[PDB]
Design a protein around this ligand. Structure first.
Ligand SMILES: O=C(O)c1ccc(Cl)cc1
Ligand SMILES: O=C(O)c1ccc(Cl)cc1
Lengths: 504, 504
C-alpha cells in the first residue's frame, strides 16, 4: 500500500522546492520540503508530550494551514486524527470525544467548547491549535522522532457521519484506504501528476472529500493546496485567477453562488485555468446544474460517494444530477430493500444501492458494533440510498431509504416532490414527510416556508402541483405552512422532530 | 490491494456488454462479460487437467486474442504465467523453462520449439495454444472452478529481463504490483476511466508495458484492447481511424515508422481520436522525436521504466528524449557508481539511478539470489543506468553502467557518440565500445557498418566527428568498418562478442 504520510513524503522528495500550501489572503507560502519539516516538528513535539501511535486525537477546527499541519503531524507521529465539524454543538463534541476514548483533542473553537469537554468526564488533554502551530510557524522541542510501522487494515483516520438515529457515527478509515480515496480524482475526475496542479480548498477538512480528494490529492500529485478559511463566491473566483487554480471541488450551494457570481462579475475575471469543476450533485436541482454548465468553465464532473466507501458512482458532463455510473475501484448492486446482498432487483425495480467493501472502505464504526453490522454485510457496504437502473444502463439516485414514503403500494421519494414545490412562487423552503395513516399506509405531507412577507395557501400549492409533472399519487395530501423548519446545528432538517411538531 | 484478476472482474461488472477485445482484421469481437466467460472456461479446463495455484506456466506466443485469454485464464486459476519472447532461440527458451521449474508451457511457435523443450530434461506439459482456445472460442470441460486467495507479496507473473551476463533473468512480479503498474498510465500519462478508451496493442504481451500498461490498463479502465498480430505502419494508422483509438504505446522504432507513414499517407487518414502517444524514449534520437511532434497527433509522453520497478520517470511534451522527472508512486536518487544507496552525488556528478522498491517492485529473480542481491538493496532498486541532475531539476539518462567507458579520468557514454556517428553520411549502424588500454585506461572505438554499396573511411568519419559537438576526449581513437554487427536473436548488439571479434 501507499499511506497518506508515504504519499506526501514521496511527493516531498520529488518536488521539495515547489509550492505545497498557500494562504494568499494571509500571505502564507509553504513548499513541500518546508511543510514536511513543520509536520516533522509538530509531530516530534506532540511525541515529546507523551503521545503514542494508535492513540485517538480529536481535531476540531475550521480550515487553515495550521490545522493541515496539525492533522498531518498527528498522522506522521502514528496517532489517529478524529476530524470533527466545529459547527457541532459544544455538548455534542464533548460526548463524541468521551464516546471515542480520545487521548487528546486539538481545538481552535471558542472557550465554551474547551469548557464543555473539560467538564464532560472525558480524560482528553485540551490542546489549543495555536499552542502547536501558528501562521505555519510551529512551536517545537525535542529531537526528530521515529516513523512507525503501518499495517493495511490498521486505523488511520476517523471521520464522522450523520446517521438516522442521533449523534454522528465515527467511521474508522484504515491505512490502505488512502490511495483509492485519492486516485479516484485521477481515474474518474481526470487529475494527473504534475506541478501544474493548483487546488482550491473550498471543502471542509473534517469531510473525507475535503481531506483525501482535495488536500491529500493536491499534495500527493506534487501540486498546491489553496487554503480557504471562509467561503465567499467573488473572492473564490479571484483566487482562481490569482492562483491559476486547475481544479475545484465544491457543494451544490457553493456552485450556485459561484456560477451566479460568475455572471455579475463576467469576463472581468479570467477563469480559463480552471479545468475541473467537481461536486456531489445527487441533491443538486436541475436549475443549479444548468447554471453551472452555462456559466462556469472546465470539465464538469458529478461525483457520488459516502464517508464509508468514498467514490462509488460518477458522470462526466452530466445532463442530470441524479444519474451516474460506477468508475475505477468500484463495484455496485441494487438489491431489494431490506433484503440480502445477493437479491438483485428486477433491473427496473427500486432498491438499495450497495457497493463492494474493498480497499477504500471503512473498517467499522468506533464502539458501535450493531451499526457496523447493519452496514458491512458479506463484503458489501449498504449506502441506505434508493436507486434504480435506467434505460441507458446507469444508476439514478432517488433518495434516502429512511426518507422514503410508501402510500398504498407505490414508493414515493420526498426529494422529488421537494424539487417541484421548491419552484413554486413564494416558496423559500420545503420538506416533504409521510405522516402515519391506516388507509393510504402513509400520507404524503408538505411542510412549506414562505418567502419574507409572502403568504402561501394549501389551495394555490395544490393547484401548482396539479400543473406539474408529478403523477397523481405523489401529490401531497396535506400542507403545513411554517415560519421555519427545525434544523440541527449543522444544518439540516430533523425529519423526526418535524413529524412530532406537526401533530400537537 | 487490487489484483489483475480483481481489476478485470470489477470492470466486467461495470461494463459487461461493452467491447473488451477486438481483432478487426480477423473480425473477432469480445465484450467484457464474454471475455470473462472464456477466461473462466479456459481456467477451469486447465484446472481439470490438474493445474494448481502458485504453479509456474511458461507462455511463449506472439500477440493474439487467444494468448490474452490464456494468460488471464492462467492468472484467474491461480497459476503464475511466465511470459517469454517467442523470438528467443529454441535452446534458450528450453533452458529457461528448465531453469524455472515450470509445471507446463503454453506454446504457439513452431514444432522445433516444442521438440527443443521436449528433449531438454525439463518436465513441462507441452500445451499448444490452439488446444486451449482458438479464435476466441475456447475448448472447455469441467465445472466452474474456485477463485483462490491472493496475498500481496505472493508471486503473480514472471517477466524476463536482459541482464549483462547471458540468459534473461526471471523477474518475479508480486500481486500487489499490478495496480501501480496500471495506474501510472492514469497519473503520468493521463488516461482516465471510461468506455471511450480504445487502446492499440502494438507492444508485445511478453513485456511488462505490453501487459500491465497496455492490456490490463485498457481492460481495467472499462475500455477496449485492439489486438495486433503483426505491426505495419500504414495498417496501424488505419486501425487508429477505424477503431477510434484513443491511446497508443509504442517503441521509438514503431514511432519512426508511424510518423513517416503519417507523412506519405497525409490527411487521408483521420488520426484526431488519438490523444495519447506514449513511449520509452531514453534511446530515441532527437530526429525521430522531432518527427513525432511534427507529424503525429495527441499528447506526447516520454516514459522511463524497468521490468523490475515499472515506471520511474516521465516527461509531458518532451523536447529531449533523455531528460525526465519522477511521477506518482516514484522516489528516485542518483548515487556514486558502485557505492551505497545513501551516497547521493554532488548534484552535478554522474551516478547510478536508483528508485525506491515499493508496491510496483519485483520480489526477486527466480532461482538467482546473487543477482537479486546486486539489484534490491536496502529498499532501493538499482537500474544500472547512469544519470545526472540537470539545471532544470530533472534527470538526464546518459546510458548503461555496463556500457560506460572511462578514458583517463573522464566518463564517456557510447550512446552519445553513436547518435553523432549515426548522422554521418553512409553510416547505417554504429556501436561504440571501449577497448582495453594501459595508458588512456580505455580506448574509445567505433564499429561502423556502411550503407548498401557505400564505403567508409576512418579518416572521413574522424573529420565528421571533429565538426560535431563532441568534446575532444570523446572522439573515437580507432574505427573498425564492418559488414555487420554480431547480434543475438532478439535483436541487440553483443558488446562482449564484438570486443573479442575486434581483436583476432
Ligand atoms: O459524503 C459525501 O457526500 C461524499 C463522500 C465521498 C465522495 Cl467521493 C463523495 C461524496
Ligand atoms: O523495460 C522497459 O523499457 C520499460 C519498463 C517499464 C516501463 Cl513503465 C517503461 C519501460
Amino acid at each position: 500500500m501507499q499511506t497518506v504520510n508515504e504519499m506526501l513524503r514521496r511527493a516531498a522528495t520529488r518536488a521539495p522546492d515547489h509550492c505545497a500550501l498557500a494562504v494568499p489572503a494571509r500571505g502564507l507560502r509553504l513548499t513541500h520540503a518546508e511543510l514536511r519539516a513543520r509536520v516533522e516538528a509538530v509531530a516530534a513535539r506532540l511525541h515529546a508530550d507523551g503521545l503514542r501511535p494508535q492513540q485517538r486525537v480529536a481535531v476540531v477546527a475550521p480550515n487553515s494551514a495550521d490545522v493541515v499541519i496539525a492533522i498531518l503531524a498527528l498522522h506522521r507521529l502514528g496517532a489517529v486524527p478524529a476530524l470533527l465539524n466545529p459547527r457541532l454543538k459544544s455538548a455534542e463534541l464533548a460526548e463524541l470525544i468521551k464516546r471515542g476514548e480520545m487521548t487528546a483533542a486539538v481545538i481552535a473553537v471558542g472557550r465554551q467548547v474547551a469548557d464543555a469537554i473539560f467538564q464532560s468526564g472525558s480524560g482528553a488533554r485540551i490542546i489549543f491549535l495555536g499552542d502547536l502551530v501558528r501562521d505555519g510557524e510551529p512551536y517545537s522541542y525535542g529531537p526528530p522522532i521515529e516513523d512507525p510501522q503501518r499495517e493495511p487494515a490498521q486505523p488511520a483516520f476517523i471521520f464522522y457521519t450523520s446517521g438516522t438515529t442521533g449523534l454522528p457515527k465515527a467511521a474508522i478509515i484504515p491505512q490502505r484506504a488512502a490511495e483509492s480515496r485519492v486516485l479516484f480524482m485521477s481515474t474518474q475526475v481526470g487529475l494527473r501528476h504534475g506541478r501544474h496542479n493548483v487546488v482550491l480548498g473550498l471543502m471542509p477538512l473534517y469531510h473525507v472529500v475535503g481531506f483525501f480528494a482535495v488536500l491529500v490529492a493536491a499534495l500527493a500529485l506534487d501540486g498546491t493546496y489553496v487554503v480557504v478559511e471562509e467561503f465567499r463566491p467573488v473572492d473564490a473566483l479571484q483566487l482562481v485567477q490569482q492562483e491559476q487554480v486547475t481544479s475545484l471541488f465544491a457543494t451544490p450551494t457553493h456552485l450556485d453562488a459561484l456560477a451566479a457570481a460568475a455572471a455579475h462579475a463576467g469576463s472581468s475575471l479570467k477563469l480559463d485555468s480552471l479545468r475541473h469543476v467537481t461536486f456531489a450533485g445527487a441533491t443538486m436541482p436541475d436549475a443549479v446544474l444548468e447554471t453551472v454548465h452555462q456559466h462556469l468553465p472546465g470539465e464538469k464532473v458529478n461525483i457520488y460517494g459516502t464517508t464509508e466507501a468514498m467514490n462509488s458512482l460518477y458522470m462526466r458532463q452530466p445532463k442530470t444530477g441524479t444519474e451516474m455510473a460506477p468508475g475505477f475501484f468500484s463495484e455496485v448492486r441494487i438489491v431489494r430493500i431490506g433484503g440480502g446482498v445477493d437479491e438483485i432487483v428486477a433491473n427496473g425495480e427500486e432498491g438499495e444501492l450497495i457497493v463492494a467493501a474493498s480497499d477504500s472502505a471503512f473498517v467499522g464504526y468506533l464502539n458501535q458494533p450493531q451499526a457496523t453490522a447493519e452496514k458491512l454485510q458479506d463484503g458489501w457496504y449498504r449506502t441506505s440510498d434508493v436507486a434504480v437502473w435506467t434505460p441507458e444502463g446507469t444508476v439514478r439516485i432517488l433518495g434516502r431509504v429512511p426518507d422514503m414514503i410508501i402510500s398504498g403500494g407505490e414508493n414515493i421519494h420526498p426529494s422529488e416532490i421537494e424539487r417541484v414545490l421548491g419552484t413554486a412562487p413564494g416558496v423559500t423552503e420545503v420538506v416533504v414527510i409521510g405522516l402515519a395513516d391506516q388507509r393510504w399506509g402513509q400520507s404524503v405531507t408538505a411542510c412549506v416556508v414562505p418567502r419574507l412577507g409572502e403568504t402561501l395557501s394549501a389551495d394555490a400549492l395544490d393547484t401548482f402541483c396539479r400543473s406539474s409533472e408529478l403523477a397523481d399519487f405523489k401529490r401531497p395530501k396535506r400542507y403545513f405552512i411554517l415560519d421555519q423548519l427545525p434544523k440541527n446545528a449543522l444544518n439540516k432538517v430533523l425529519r423526526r422532530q418535524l413529524v412530532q411538531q406537526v401533530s400537537s
